[PDB]
């Protein structure tokens, strides 16, 4: 009743070009079985959205990677938010929601925008730059570690630690094995910066620790919640900004529309998140037998959600494979959906918006002028190198 496929969604060939295989996964049926890894898969928008929005049946506390924490030991102490279910999820979620709240965004927006304008000014003096290292990486690194309250020393561990986290959600392939082999210095830095004395006053980390006296989290929970922001607070933003620049370089007509109305900047970034979904996949684990898309799935089964595929499902999107900066993007699942929907989405959108706004106002053309290189990760989609020439407006 359920089609069995041999597609490996964590193979380098898949990463290099996932879109044909994602169509094969969608068109095979609403629920597939992936024989390579012994997991169920859902690749259409409808089932991915349904799974995300049923946390009782499709839980997160047994891991949102391949590994089932009821069977294997987690590679690090589980996240108190990403790998918790309601009700244990609820109060830590509330703390991060308030720390990264609409009101917090007002306190950081002027500085984030000035830093974006300054970065584009700097890059326009160089002309030919690497839009990953020099822009997608450099700009979030210039604003987010400071907003966290991190010291200057050791920041080189942040992106390697995040890549390790992304690879560790995957199956036990070479990407995951090698990440864990190299992990010790990055984990040691990150865990140490989570302690209250190492977080500068007024930043995100200090604000998490300040919430330890409301009854929502205890002092011993705050280091792990800081760890969540050091895990997730950079690499997907890097990849999303790089994807947006890639899209503007590939679809010059959309750069021209963006230049003509810079207030499209926020939606241009949101469309880039839909189009080149920085988080491609997450897992859930069934807590009971469940019927999903006409399929019966037993208890204790891993279900792989293809978020990038759901964001390109023609059953939900018109011309899904077009980058359209005026698309109604509401409802895409690049940030998830439901109770775990990205608690840092306002930070990511702020960074993406103000960077795309600075490009819209300052740059006339973005031309790829070198070999584009892909960055491979079991969970993240993004580029390693994006050589571009920036022409000033």
Ligand X SMILES: COc1ccc(C(=O)O)cc1O
Binding site, annotated residues for heme b: 89, 93, 284, 340, 342
In terms of CB distance, is 81 or 268 closer to ligand X? 81
Q: What span, in angstroms and rounded, lies between the C-alpha atoms of 36 and 246?
A: 32
Query: Pairing relation of β-strands 363-368 and 387-392?
Result: antiparallel
Q: How many CB atoms lie within 10 A of CB 291?
A: 9
Do the Cβ atoms of 298 and 286 come closer than 8 Å?
yes
Q: Is 231 in the site for ligand X (CB under 6 A)?
A: yes
Footprint of ligand X on 278-317 (CB under 6 A): 279
**Which phi and psi angles does 86 have, rounded to 5°?**
-60, 140
Q: Is 247 in the site for ligand HEM (CB under 6 A)?
A: no
Q: What span, in angstroms and rounded, lies between the C-alpha atoms of 220 and 121?
A: 43
Distance set, CA 165 to CA 114, 223, 257 (Å)? 31, 17, 37
Reduce the DSSP state of residue 349 to 3 states and report it. Answer: helix
Q: What span, in angstroms and rounded, lies between the C-alpha atoms of 278 and 303?
A: 19
- In this chain, which residue has its C-beta nearest to ligand HEM? 344
Footprint of ligand X on 163-192 (CB under 6 A): 165
Q: Is 82 in the site for ligand X (CB under 6 A)?
A: yes
**Six-digit token pair at 119?**
């970065």
Query: Residue 283's beta-bridge partner residues?
Result: 304
Residue showing tokens 């963006």: 258
Q: Is the dihedral of CA 119, 124, 130, 131 positive or negative?
A: positive
Interaction mask 265-304, ligand HEM, x per CB under 6 A: --------x----xx--x----------------------
Q: Is 61 in the site for ligand HEM (CB under 6 A)?
A: no
Helix (H) or strand (E) holding 375, with range, is strand 373-376
Interaction mask 201-230, ligand X, x per CB under 6 A: ---------------------------x--
Q: 165 contacts which partner out of ligand X, ligand HEM, none, CB within 5 to 8 A by kind?
A: ligand X
In terms of CB distance, is 37 or 275 closer to ligand HEM? 275
Q: 273 contacts which partner out of ligand X, ligand HEM, none, CB within 5 to 8 A by kind?
A: ligand HEM
In terms of CB distance, is 29 or 205 closer to ligand X? 205
Q: Is 143 in the site for ligand X (CB under 6 A)?
A: no
Helix (H) or strand (E) holding 292, with range, is strand 290-292
94: DSSP letter: H
Interaction mask 253-282, ligand X, x per CB under 6 A: --------------------------x---
Q: 96 contacts which partner out of ligand HEM, ligand X, none, CB within 5 to 8 A by kind?
A: ligand HEM
Q: Is 340 in the site for ligand HEM (CB under 6 A)?
A: yes
In terms of CB distance, is 29 or 336 closer to ligand HEM? 336
- Size of the residue set binding ligand HEM (CB under 6 A): 28
Q: What span, in angstroms and rounded, lies between the C-alpha atoms of 47 and 306?
A: 10
Applying CB under 6 A, the span of 208-216, 225-233, 318-326, 370-378 interacting with ligand HEM comes to 225-233
CA 221 to chain centre: 23
Applying CB under 6 A, which residues contact ligand HEM?
60, 64, 81-82, 93, 96, 100, 228-229, 232-233, 236-237, 240, 273, 278-279, 282, 307, 334-336, 340, 342-344, 347-348
């Amino acid at each position: 009743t359920i089609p069995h496929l041999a597609i490996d969604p964590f193979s380098l060939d898949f990463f290099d070009d996932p879109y044909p295989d994602q169509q094969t996964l969608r068109d095979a049926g609403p629920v597939v079985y992936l024989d390579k890894w012994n997991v169920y898969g859902v690749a259409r928008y409808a089932e991915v959205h349904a799974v995300l929005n049923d946390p009782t049946t499709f839980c997160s506390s047994r891991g949102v990677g391949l590994s089932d924490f009821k069977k294997e030991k987690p590679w690090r102490p589980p996240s108190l938010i990403l790998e918790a279910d309601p009700p244990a999820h609820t109060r830590p979620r509330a703390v991060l929601s308030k720390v990264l709240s609409p009101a917090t965004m007002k306190t950081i927006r002027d500085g984030f925008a000035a830093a974006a304008d300054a970065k584009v000014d700097e890059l326009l003096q160089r002309g030919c730059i690497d839009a990953i290292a020099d822009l997608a990486e450099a700009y979030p690194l210039s604003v987010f570690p400071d907003a966290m309250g991190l010291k200057q020393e050791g920041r080189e561990h942040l992106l390697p630690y995040a890549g390790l986290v992304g690879n560790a959600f995957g199956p036990p392939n070479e990407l995951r094995q090698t990440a864990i082999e190299r992990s010790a210095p990055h984990q040691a830095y990150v865990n140490e910066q989570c302690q209250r004395p190492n977080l500068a006053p007024g930043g995100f980390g200090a604000c998490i620790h300040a919430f330890t006296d409301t009854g929502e989290i205890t002092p011993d929970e705050a280091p792990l919640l800081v760890r969540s922001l050091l895990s997730a607070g950079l690499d997907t933003t890097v990849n999303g900004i790089g994807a947006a620049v890639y899209c503007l370089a590939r679809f010059p007509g959309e750069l021209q529309r963006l230049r003509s109305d810079p207030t499209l900047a926020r939606n241009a970034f949101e469309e880039a998140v839909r189009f080149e979904s920085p988080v491609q996949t997450f897992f859930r684990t069934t807590t009971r037998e469940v019927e999903l898309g006409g399929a019966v799935i037993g208890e204790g089964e891993k279900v792989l959600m293809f978020l990038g595929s759901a964001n390109r499902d023609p059953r939900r999107w018109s011309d899904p494979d077009l980058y359209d900066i005026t698309r109604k993007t509401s409802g895409h699942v690049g940030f998830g959906s439901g109770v775990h929907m990205c608690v840092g989405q306002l930070v990511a959108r702020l960074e993406g918006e103000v960077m795309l706004s600075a490009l819209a106002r300052k740059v006339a053309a973005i031309d790829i002028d070198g070999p584009v290189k892909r960055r491979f990760n079991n969970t993240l989609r993004g580029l390693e190198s994006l050589p571009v020439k920036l022409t000033p407006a």
